[PDB]
Amino acid sequence: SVPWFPKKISDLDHCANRVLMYGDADHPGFKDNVYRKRRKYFADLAMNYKHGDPIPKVEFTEEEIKTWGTVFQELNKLYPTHACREYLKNLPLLSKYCGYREDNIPQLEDVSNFLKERTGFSIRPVAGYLSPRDFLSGLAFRVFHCTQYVRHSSDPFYTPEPDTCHELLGHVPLLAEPSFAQFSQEIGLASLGASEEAVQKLATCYFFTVEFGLCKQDGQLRVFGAGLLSSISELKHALSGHAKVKPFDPKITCKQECLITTFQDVYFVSESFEDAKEKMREFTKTIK
Numbered sequence: 001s002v003p004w005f006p007k008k009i010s011d012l013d014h015c016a017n018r019v020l021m022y023g024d025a026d027h028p029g030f031k032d033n034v035y036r037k038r039r040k041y042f043a044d045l046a047m048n049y050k051h052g053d054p055i056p057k058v059e060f061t062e063e064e065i066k067t068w069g070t071v072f073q074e075l076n077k078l079y080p081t082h083a084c085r086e087y088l089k090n091l092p093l094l095s096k097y098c099g100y101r102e103d104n105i106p107q108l109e110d111v112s113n114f115l116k117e118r119t120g121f122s123i124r125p126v127a128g129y130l131s132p133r134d135f136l137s138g139l140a141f142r143v144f145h146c147t148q149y150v151r152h153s154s155d156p157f158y159t160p161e162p163d164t165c166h167e168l169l170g171h172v173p174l175l176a177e178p179s180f181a182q183f184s185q186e187i188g189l190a191s192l193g194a195s196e197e198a199v200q201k202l203a204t205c206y207f208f209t210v211e212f213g214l215c216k217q218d219g220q221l222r223v224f225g226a227g228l229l230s231s232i233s234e235l236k237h238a239l240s241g242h243a244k245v246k247p248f249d250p251k252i253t254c255k256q257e258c259l260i261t262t263f264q265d266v267y268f269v270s271e272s273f274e275d276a277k278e279k280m281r282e283f284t285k286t287i288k
C-alpha cells in the first residue's frame with residue numbers, strides 16, 4: 001500500500017515537525033549555553049507554526065547580523081562571476097523588496113510573500129532535519145522548509161549544517177525563477193507516496209541539482225546549487241579547474257553518493273532548468 005503523504009498544503013503540519021533538532025557534539029556552538037537556548041527558541045517557533053500563520057518575525061542579535069554580514073560580503077564578491085544568470089537576475093529584487101543587506105537578515109515571512117507573488121513558492125520554518133520523503137513532499141505544494149537560526153559566530157564559514165544564511169542566499173533567489181520552481185515542484189510531485197527506492201533516487205537527483213548543481217550558460221559553467229551558493233570555499237572550488245564534472249543524467253546521477261562533511265567528489269552539469277526538468281520527467285516514468 002501507498003505510505004501516508006500530504007494531499008493539501010496544510011497536511012505539511014503533520015510531518016514538518018518530525019525532526020532531528022540541535023543537541024552535534026563537535027558543533028561549534030555545542031558548549032555555548034546562550035547559543036543552545038537560542039537554538040531552542042528557533043526550534044520552538046518552527047514546532048509551533050501551523051500553516052496559515054504568518055511566519056514569526058525574529059529580532060536577530062548584533063552577533064547574528066555580523067555573522068550574516070561576513071558571509072554575505074564574501075559571497076557577493078563571487079556571485080557575478082560564479083552564479084547562473086537566473087540567480088543574478090533575482091538577487092537584486094530580493095535586496096529591494098526583502099531587505100537583503102550586509103547589515104540586515106531578511107525575515108522568512110517577507111521572503112515567503114515575495115516568492116508567493118513570483119512563483120507561488122512559500123516558506124515554512126523548520127526546526128531541524130526532516131526525512132527526504134517529508135522534505136520532498138513540501139516541494140509538491142511549492143513549500144520550501146527553511147531553517148531560521150544562524151550559524152555560531154565562532155565560525156562564520158561553517159556549512160555542513162544548513163542555517164538561514166544558506167536558505168536565504170542559496171535557495172531563495174532560484175525559487176523566485178519560474179522554470180526552477182517548476183523543476184523543484186516536479187521532484188516533490190514525483191516523490192508523493194513513492195517507494196523508498198524512488199524517494200532515495202529523487203532525493204539524490206535533488207541533491208545534485210537544487211543543492212550542488214552546475215549549469216552551462218553561453219558555453220561557460222555557472223553555479224545554481226544552493227549548497228555551493230552559500231559556501232565561499234566550495235563555490236570557488238566548483239568553478240576551478242580542479243573539480244570533476246559530469247553531465248546531469250538522472251539514471252546515472254541518482255547512484256552518486258551525497259557528501260556532507262567535505263566538498264563533493266563530483267558535480268553534475270545541467271544544460272538548463274528546462275532540460276533538467278525534461279530529463280527528470282523521462283526518469284520518473286521508470287521509477288513508477
Ligand SMILES: CCc1nc(C)ccc1OCC(=O)N1CCc2nc3n(c2[C@@H]1c1ccc(Cl)cc1F)CCCC3
Pocket residue numbers: 129130131132135136159160161162166203206207211226227258259260
Ligand atoms: C531531499 C533532501 C534531503 N535529503 C536527504 C538524504 C536527507 C534529508 C533531506 O532533506 C532535509 C535535509 O536534511 N536537507 C535538505 C536541505 C539541505 N540543504 C543543505 N543540506 C540539506 C539537508 C541534507 C542533509 C543531508 C543530506 Cl545527505 C542531504 C541534504 F539535502 C545539507 C548541507 C548542504 C545544504
Ligand SMILES: [Fe+3]
Pocket residue numbers: 162166171211226227
Ligand atoms: Fe539546502
